[PDB]
């Protein structure tokens, strides 16, 4: 009865920016998703392909726990078939996504008076992300026709924008920590089951 180290992912000290979203591979452990679902702690816990009410009656080969931080109003974008800055340039879920999206407000931790600039998100990109793609390039985005020559200015933009995380913001603009649980299913022995 090895329990899955979800405390490492959820109760982590620091979370990654969405463009540099972090991933934790989870295998050979017993996962109690039910405790999380009924936790009164997370503001969002929506599943796709599975039903959260009795999903710990299931087994998978591996579980990917992606973690990052976004703005509250952007939590709606962490879902299959969504458009927006985050879903296009930061974190894309596939149309056939099978897994859960968990988000909780972290204003008390990831805010700072006058703005916390630790958390950034990609604002420009030549094309949309493929599902589960991670792009950490800091190349000067060329919006115009003349090359940027590695210097930014007119039609030459730095691709990452910073959240100005002040605790005085509205909810839509407060920091939310997000964990996406993806359930990978290979032709191999299934190593992550629930309590039964």
């Amino acid at each position, epitope marked *: 009865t090895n329990l899955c180290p979800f405390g490492e992912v959820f109760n982590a000290t620091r979370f990654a920016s969405v463009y540099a979203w972090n991933r934790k591979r989870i295998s050979n452990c017993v996962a109690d998703y039910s405790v999380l679902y009924n936790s*009164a702690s997370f503001s*969002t*816990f*929506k599943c796709y392909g599975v039903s959260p009410t009795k999903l710990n009656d299931l087994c998978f080969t591996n579980v990917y726990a992606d973690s990052f931080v976004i703005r509250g109003d952007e939590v709606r974008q962490i879902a299959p078939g969504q458009t927006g800055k985050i879903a296009d340039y930061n974190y894309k879920l596939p149309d056939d996504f099978t897994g859960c999206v968990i988000a909780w407000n972290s204003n008390n931790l990831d805010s700072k008076v006058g703005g916390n600039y630790n958390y950034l998100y990609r604002l420009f990109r030549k094309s949309n992300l493929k599902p589960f793609e991670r792009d950490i390039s800091t190349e000067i985005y060329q919006a115009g026709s003349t090359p940027c020559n590695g210097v930014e200015g007119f039609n030459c933009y730095f691709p990452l924008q910073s959240y100005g995380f002040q605790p005085t913001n509205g*909810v839509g603009y*407060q920091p939310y920590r997000v964990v996406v649980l993806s359930f990978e299913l290979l032709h191999a022995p299934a190593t992550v089951c629930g309590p039964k």
Partner: antibody
Amino acid sequence: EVQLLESGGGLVQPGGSLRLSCAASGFTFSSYAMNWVRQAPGKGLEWVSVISGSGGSTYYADSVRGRFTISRDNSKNTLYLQMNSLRAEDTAVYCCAKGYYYDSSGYYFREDAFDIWGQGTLVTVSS
Amino acid sequence: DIQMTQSPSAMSASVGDRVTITCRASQGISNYLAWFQQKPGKVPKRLIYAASSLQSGVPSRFSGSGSGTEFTLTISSLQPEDFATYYCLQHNSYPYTFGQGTKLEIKR
């Protein structure tokens, strides 16, 4: 425009029954949890019950447990509170309140709740 | 049962005063806290919904702060239509519980 219209209150003797309904319009009714909140005359607010959008999860205050039953017909966009074994202390104005996004697939914005309340209906239990 | 303690129970102030109402929770409720106003004979109207997030259509003199166990509703400059009763509500854990209420009266 979100709208909740209650009906079904009235005078009833102790031990009697009464079934309140709250008709909803202007939003996806089947996607949000719904609440009943009562207020006795000249006293404070008291939460009564919650039902999930799916209709699968129901939670009650202890003071009405086992007597009241919350339910919903999503096809009619209506919430119901069935009050049996009514006691005089249940005399109150009963308000219907829109809760947080609580789907068949999970919950979304658990902070955003009680944004919209029904006009309330009066339930007077007395002998 | 999480118990919400409002202070003060009653309070009288003049128009223009800065009014501060406190709500303490017996346990942690994170940010699942709302502030409602109730005029006599009317329906509760929401003023603040995520302990600090103002409701659309509510004047900016109203503001909410705090988290964990202590929370504060504040009116910067009182106004005639602000004389009412204010309730705080935790909706973190069942059963959801309101505060005892705070009635804001006119001072003479």
